């Protein structure tokens, strides 16, 4: 509660000051309070704060709430991931110049979504929770975790003194929430795969066009994924270290798989195989990433730094894979 | 989570599905 006092009374530095306009941005050295501050600057500089009558008081409480609802004990999927995603998302709209391509309702939704896309993530993938018959699997059908992340997001927005949306007409609110649901679900890698093909072609065939309502909301999914794993597009020293966390969290799951599940983990989560990391990274980048960031640049050239940083790390992993 | 059977190996060897 004092955390709210101190926060809702500190000066929010400029975006320039905070270097949040950068695709090459890092949080490693920021404090907790600083990250929250960036967030506020994000909302502010996207005009979300003024166009939706947000009270400094409320936004602050809300942000704080999301912060405290990411698990500390969880290796990669903690608050700094939600934060690094939203900053990527923010960088995309500004420097990548996409803001000029979509509505204020969409921007708001993307930001709120980016921030909460992994709420209460318990450091384990959809595959595991399904195969271990977690009650969450009994509750939700497909995109289990992502459904939960949203159930949470929404719980918080309905919390008292957290209604950062309170200012919206009922129609606005109603469709914002729709988009937010779509956004969070889109961060399910399975949907990214089962949908990206479609989108890769409209690009390929120089046919892709935002105006099209459907073509847009597809792209909005693709944009979510884009930011969700933007970490892979970071300077080597950063990519290095954040890959260290993904590493541990995976291995942590791998342990559970053979200790409670009594199965063998995939090599990627097989702690013992730590020496096959870099090729596993390479294959993943090839399979999941380059493909996507290429696309994103065709849509917006100013988004190229992402593609550049991506293949640049792929370069360094490949080298390593060859010892 | 039903995908083409050819995809299935790659999908699984990464944390997906
Ligand atoms: C759109 C909304 C009214 C539906 N909805 C929802 O999907 N979840 C998960 C909730 O927890 C919730 N609470 C009120 N409405 C809710
Ligand atoms: C339908 C309405 C009474 C509920 N409601 C709400 O719960 N939150 C959080 C809002 O931001 C909002 N804006 C309009 N209505 C809203
Ligand atoms: C959430 C996670 C499975 C996605 N993800 C990611 O974001 N980065 C950066 C990786 O290097 C990686 N490797 C496997 N999955 C990965
Ligand atoms: Mg997710
Ligand atoms: Zn995520």
End-to-end distance of chain B, in Å?
6 Å
Shape of chain A: globular
Oligomer: heterodimer
* Strand portion of chain A: under 5%
Determine the structural class of chain B based on helices, strands and strand pairing: mainly alpha
H-E string of chain A: HHHHHHHHHHHHHHHH
| Number of self-contained structural domains of chain A | 1
CATH superfamily of chain A: 3'5'-cyclic nucleotide phosphodiesterase, catalytic domain
Query: Given the C-alpha coordinates, what overall shape of chain B results?
Result: flat
Biggest pleated sheet of chain A: none
Number of helices of chain A: 16
Which secondary-structure class do the elements of chain A indicate? mainly alpha
Taking Cα atoms only, what radius of gyration of chain B do you get, to the nearest Å?
Answer: 7 Å
Question: Order of helices and strands of chain B, N to C?
Answer: H
The end-to-end distance of chain A, rounded to whole angstroms, is 50 Å
Family (chain A): Belongs to the cyclic nucleotide phosphodiesterase family.
Organism (chain A): Homo sapiens (Human)
Protein name (chain A): cGMP-specific 3',5'-cyclic phosphodiesterase
Function (chain A): Plays a role in signal transduction by regulating the intracellular concentration of cyclic nucleotides. This phosphodiesterase catalyzes the specific hydrolysis of cGMP to 5'-GMP. Specifically regulates nitric-oxide-generated cGMP.
């Amino acid at each position: 509660t004092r955390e709210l006092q101190s926060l809702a009374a500190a000066v929010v530095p400029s975006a320039q000051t905070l270097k949040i306009t950068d695709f090459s941005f890092s949080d490693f050295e920021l404090s907790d309070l600083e990250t929250a501050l960036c967030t506020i600057r994000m909302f502010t500089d996207l005009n979300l704060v003024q166009n939706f009558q947000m009270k400094h008081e409320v936004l602050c409480r809300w942000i704080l709430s999301v912060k405290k609802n990411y698990r500390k004990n969880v290796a990669y999927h903690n608050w700094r991931h939600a934060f690094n995603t939203a900053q990527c998302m923010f960088a995309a709209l500004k420097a990548g110049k996409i803001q000029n391509k979509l509505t204020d309702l969409e921007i708001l939704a993307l930001l709120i979504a980016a921030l909460s896309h992994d709420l209460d993530h318990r450091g384990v993938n959809n595959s595991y929770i399904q195969r271990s018959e977690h009650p969450l699997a009994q509750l939700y059908c497909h995109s289990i975790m992502e459904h939960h992340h949203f159930d949470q997001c929404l719980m918080i927005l309905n919390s008292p003194g957290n209604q950062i949306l309170s200012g919206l007409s009922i129609e606005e609110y109603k469709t914002t929430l729709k988009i937010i649901k779509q956004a969070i679900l889109a961060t399910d890698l399975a949907l990214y795969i089962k949908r990206r093909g479609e989108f890769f072609e409209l690009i390929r065939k120089n046919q892709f066009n935002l105006e099209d309502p459907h073509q847009k909301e597809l792209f909005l999914a693709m944009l979510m994924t884009a930011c969700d794993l933007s970490a892979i597009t970071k300077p080597w020293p950063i990519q290095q270290r954040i890959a260290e966390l993904v590493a541990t969290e995976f291995w942590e799951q791998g342990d559970l798989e053979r200790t409670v599940l009594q199965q063998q983990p995939i090599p990627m989560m097989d702690r013992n195989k730590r020496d096959e990391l870099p090729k596993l990274q390479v294959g993943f980048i090839d399979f999941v990433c380059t493909q996507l960031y290429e696309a994103l640049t065709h849509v917006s050239e100013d988004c190229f730094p992402l593609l550049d940083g991506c293949r640049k790390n792929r370069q360094k992993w490949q080298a390593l894979a060859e010892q | 989570e039903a995908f083409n059977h050819l995809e299935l190996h790659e999908l699984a060897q990464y944390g997906i599905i």
